[PDB]
Amino acid sequence: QEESRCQRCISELKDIRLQLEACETRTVHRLRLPLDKEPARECAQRIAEQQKAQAEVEGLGKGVARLSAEAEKVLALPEPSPAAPTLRSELELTLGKLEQVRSLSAIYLEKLKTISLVIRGTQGAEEVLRAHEEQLKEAQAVPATLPELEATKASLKKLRAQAEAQQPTFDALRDELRGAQEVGERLQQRHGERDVEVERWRERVAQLLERWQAVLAQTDVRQRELEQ
């Protein structure tokens, strides 16, 4: 009539392990998807989504704890039970899967958060560089008068000071990209999944650095022209 607690526990353990495996596959499919053409917004949205995913996993973990307690109660009865090894085996598989899915959920969330810092940081650097690149372009004009020359020279002095002052911004950007790269590598090493996102932002950072270096270098050239 009523099935044994042993058989019911085996069934429930298999069921919850399937739900964990589904969380797992879901997460793999997400982390394989590169950001598209609105990376800031998409990344914030995906972070929110992954925080929930991670909470769903923790709810399953509480189910696993409940089934583990029940399993151990059954396994502790003194009577012979040829089913006991199956119950033990299924418990240990479910417990292992839980840890694996927890790990993966946490590292993917971490990957998203580090990428989000690089994205924010690069978009900030763009807006400052644009201002500086325009000031420099304006300083390229030939001044008409001796007084305009002095204004151009003053504009360049200002520009150099402003551009040099961005040192902290670019140091932090490089650190953030380093952070993002390291997370991706650990995901690769621990879960065998390549980092589909980091190359885009490595290139972004590299180009922005080069533009910053060029503002500094060409400001110095232009200042030197006007002195001699």
DSSP for 74-127, written as a single string: HHTSSS--TTHHHHHHHHHHHHHHHHHHHHHHHHHHHHHHHHHHHHHHHHHHHH
Number of domains in the chain: 1
CA-wise closest residue to 28 among 97, 87, 108: 108
- CATH code at position 66: 1.20.58.60
d(CA 60, CA 196): 28
Count CA atoms within 13 Å of residue 4 on its CB side: 12
Angle at 57 between CA 54 and CA 58, to 5 degrees: 90
Contact 12, 93 (CB under 8 A): no
Euclidean distance between CA atoms 195 and 71, whole angstroms: 39
Q: Locate 167 and state its tokens.
A: 């040192």
Contact criterion met (CB below 8 Å) for 208 and 174: no
What are 50's two structure tokens?
Answer: 């992954």
Q: How far is 168 from 218, CA to CA, in rounded Å?
A: 20
Q: How many helices (H) and strands (E) does the chain have?
A: 6, 0
Query: SS3 sequence, the chain?
Result: CCCCHHHHHHHHHHHHHHHHHHHHHHHHHHHCCCCCCCHHHHHHHHHHHHHHHHHHHHHHHHHHHHHHHHHHHHHCCCCCCCCHHHHHHHHHHHHHHHHHHHHHHHHHHHHHHHHHHHHHHHHHHHHHHHHHHHHHHHHCCCCCCHHHHHHHHHHHHHHHHHHHCCHHHHHHHHHHHHHHHHHHHHHHHHHCCCCCCHHHHHHHHHHHHHHHHHHHHHHHHHHHHHHC
State how far the Cα of 54 lies from the Cα of 32, in Å rounded to an integer: 17
Calculate helix-pair angle for 84-139, 5-31, nearest 10 degrees: 20
CA-to-CA distance for 54 and 220, rounded, in angstroms? 52
What was the structure determination method? Answer: X-ray
Q: Which CA distances in Å does 214 have to 132, 148, 218, 220, 224?
A: 11, 24, 6, 10, 15
The contacts found for 62-67 with CB under 8 angstroms, 24 or more apart, are: 63/16, 64/16, 64/20, 64/94, 64/95, 64/98, 67/9, 67/12, 67/13, 67/16, 67/91, 67/94
185 token code pair = 């590598």
* Alpha carbon separation from 169 to 43, 90, 159, 172, 177 (Å, rounded): 21, 52, 16, 5, 12
Domain of residue 18: give its range: 1-228
- Residues with Cβ within 8 Å of 212's Cβ and at least 6 positions away in sequence, in order, are 125, 129, 163, 166, 170
Q: What resolution does the deposited structure have, in angstroms? A: 1.8
**Cα(165)–Cα(162) distance, integer angstroms:** 5
CA distance 200 to 208: 13
Do residues 75 and 84 lie in contact, with contact meaning Cβ atoms separated by under 8 Å? yes
Residue with tokens 């973990």: 61
Q: How far apart are CA 62 and CA 48, in angstroms?
A: 22
Q: Quick one: DSSP state of residue 143?
A: P
Task: Tell me which residue has tokens 């003053």.
Answer: 154
Convert 97-116 to b/e letters by CB count within 10 Å (16 or more is b).
bbeebbebbebbbbbbbbbb
